[PDB]
Amino acid sequence: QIITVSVNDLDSFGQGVARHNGKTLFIPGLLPQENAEVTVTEDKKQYARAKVVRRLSDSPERETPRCPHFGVCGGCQQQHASVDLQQRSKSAALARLMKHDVSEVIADVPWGYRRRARLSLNYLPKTQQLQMGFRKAGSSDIVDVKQCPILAPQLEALLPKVRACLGSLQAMRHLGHVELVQATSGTLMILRHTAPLSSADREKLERFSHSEGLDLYLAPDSEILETVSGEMPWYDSNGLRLTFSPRDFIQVNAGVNQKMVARALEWLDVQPEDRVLDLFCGMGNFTLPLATQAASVVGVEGVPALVEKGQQNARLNGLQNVTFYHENLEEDVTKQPWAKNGFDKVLLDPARAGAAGVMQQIIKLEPIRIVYVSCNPATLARDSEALLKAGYTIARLAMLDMFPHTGHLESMVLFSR
Ligand code: SF4
Ligand SMILES: [Cl-]
Ligand code: NI
Ligand code: NI
């Protein structure tokens, strides 16, 4: 009960890392080189946890959190760390894993950067209140969100007005969640609800969205999406106009995404005669901009709805030299007819698990350059080993600061011969 410690390190996840009596201590709210009186409620084998009771000193990289919900909301972990410190700590971890220096950090605005949010809704029958916000750290309980400085300003401004509108509904107790999305075309609101809405409630929602200039969609279940108002949304990115369905996945950080795509294109050094392969291509985030430079592009993706949107967006942007295939990237696809003309360049952006079975497949293809975008540096590091064994070197490595103030650690690597 009560001991004095010094924090050595700031981990990926935003807790300070210290040692006491030779055991690792994880302390939330404490930064590298700060000292503190602390208490452990949680003592285990390989490590222990503790809370700050009194912080004795301050790092020069310490900032004042901009959000009043920070420390309680599960959404942010590191608002107390300056952006330089966040970037330095993540870059250091990445460099250590890859055994290679970080060439650059790709970043944009540290605040106001999220172009979509899903707000959970929960009804409290004992007090007849509606909660609207995000999950708490290590709990399913909702923090009522009144401000969210990471959210795009158009969306942040809507928070109290959405709250008062939903709080006015008869159907308040039967609401699931509400998604707010900002796109070049307009602002979108999607309300997921659990039973039929009355006409008085539909009218409130209609008048509200109509007053605020929002496109409104209602989702009575997991498949149905009714357009109350709006035309097909779209956003502009990297020289293209890209339509999307309000359910479909679009990137959270628009600015960092556009910079990532632009950089990946510079790294691939795409030539007019190049044939390019884009694995895990989604609806063509990288694929469509690659087609503006290359002789031809193939995208491969496992969701058919994304393959069809990629095709639609190619046509809309006058891209005749790109083909999208639906494939299962867990199986062997060097077999396929689209492989045989071969590839000069390959880009892949998989999920957390990585592309393990895929690395040998890429190697068989013998591209002169490969760009790999990862959200899990551990799997990136394992997959890199296979490319290094087959004669590729690390030409460039970047830390992508896609989710400021969180524990995410995204990265991008250029391999070449
Ligand atoms: S900025 Fe938003 S996500 Fe981050 S702690 Fe505040 S409410 Fe949660
Ligand atoms: Cl939905
Ligand atoms: Ni939803
Ligand atoms: Ni090097």
Curated annotation (Swiss-Prot):
A GO MF label: RNA binding
Active site positions: 375
Domain of life, source organism: Bacteria
Keyword Transferase belongs to the record: yes
Region (Interaction with RNA): 9-26, 44-49
Keywords of the record: 4Fe-4S, Iron, Iron-sulfur, Metal-binding, Methyltransferase, rRNA processing, S-adenosyl-L-methionine, Transferase
Annotated positions for site Interaction with RNA: 118, 135
Domain TRAM, residue spans: 1-54
One GO term (biological process): rRNA base methylation
Residue numbers binding [4Fe-4S] cluster: 67, 73, 76, 148
Catalytic activity: uridine(1939) in 23S rRNA + S-adenosyl-L-methionine = 5-methyluridine(1939) in 23S rRNA + S-adenosyl-L-homocysteine + H(+)
Note: The function of the iron-sulfur cluster remains unclear. It may be involved in the correct folding of the protein or may have a role in RNA binding.
Domain notes: Contains three structural domains: an N-terminal TRAM domain, a central domain containing an iron-sulfur cluster, and a C-terminal domain that displays the typical SAM-dependent methyltransferase fold.
Matches recorded under HAMAP family: 23SrRNA_methyltr_RlmD
Similarity comment: Belongs to the class I-like SAM-binding methyltransferase superfamily. RNA M5U methyltransferase family. RlmD subfamily.
Name recorded for this polypeptide: 23S rRNA (uracil(1939)-C(5))-methyltransferase RlmD
